DNA sequence: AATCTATCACCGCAAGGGATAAATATCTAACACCGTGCGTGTTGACTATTTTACCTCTGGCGGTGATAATGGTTGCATGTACTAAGGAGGTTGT
């Protein structure tokens, strides 16, 4: 109770169009179960961090493979999402269309 | 359903055109030979077909970070045309 509005500030930024402007506020006051469970003070860190690190990864995963319909070992959902974001280079770089053959320079590896 | 005279014409019956098939002569193809070289055979040494063993890849997924971060986003459902229903509440009536 005391944090549920903490839970809005975080929850609110992946809301932007993401699933649906309302429903991560919801599963983030879920990961707050998790936080307030293991909330280790005797470190002598504050809620605030706490918040950033675990109920924004909950607030994260409440779209990411939860509701959608596809899921995956989660390093190979985001690393989909590593090659969009590595796209804002190509995009402007190579900067006309987007081309595989530029990602594996930025990747280091071979496409296939 | 038979009869024919008297139509417009097919027959009455001369001509002649193309045709095809005979004989000739040309073409090609089918073959039989030869020669080439490849996929005829076993053997043998190679090296890496598979297995298992061992030593030690890739990627299975579980786990969760702390100088601190503690009132949020979200834009347009709709402007029209109807009108049936429920909702309000004071009151002049039932």
């Given at each position: 109770?005391?944090?549920?509005?903490?839970?809005?500030?975080?929850?609110?930024?992946?809301?932007?169009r993401?699933?649906?402007?309302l429903?991560?506020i919801?599963?983030?006051?879920?990961?707050?179960?998790?936080?307030?469970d293991?909330?280790?003070?005797?470190?002598?860190?504050?809620?605030?961090?706490?918040?950033?690190?675990?109920?924004?990864?909950?607030i994260?995963?409440?779209?990411?493979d939860?509701?959608?319909?596809?899921?995956?070992?989660?390093?190979?959902?985001?690393?989909?999402?590593?090659l969009?974001?590595?796209?804002?280079?190509?995009?402007?770089?190579?900067?006309?269309?987007?081309?595989?053959?530029?990602?594996?320079?930025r990747?280091?590896?071979?496409?296939?």
């Amino acid at each position: 109770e005391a944090n549920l509005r903490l839970v809005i500030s975080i929850a609110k930024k992946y809301t932007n169009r993401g699933l649906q402007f309302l429903d991560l506020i919801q599963e983030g006051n879920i990961g707050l179960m998790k936080a307030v469970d293991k909330f280790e003070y005797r470190r002598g860190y504050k809620f605030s961090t706490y918040a950033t690190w675990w109920i924004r990864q909950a607030i994260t995963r409440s779209i990411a493979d939860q509701a959608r319909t596809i899921r995956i070992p989660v390093h190979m959902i985001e690393t989909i999402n590593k090659l969009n974001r590595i796209s804002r280079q190509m995009l402007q770089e190579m900067g006309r269309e987007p081309t595989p053959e530029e990602l594996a320079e930025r990747m280091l590896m071979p496409e296939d």
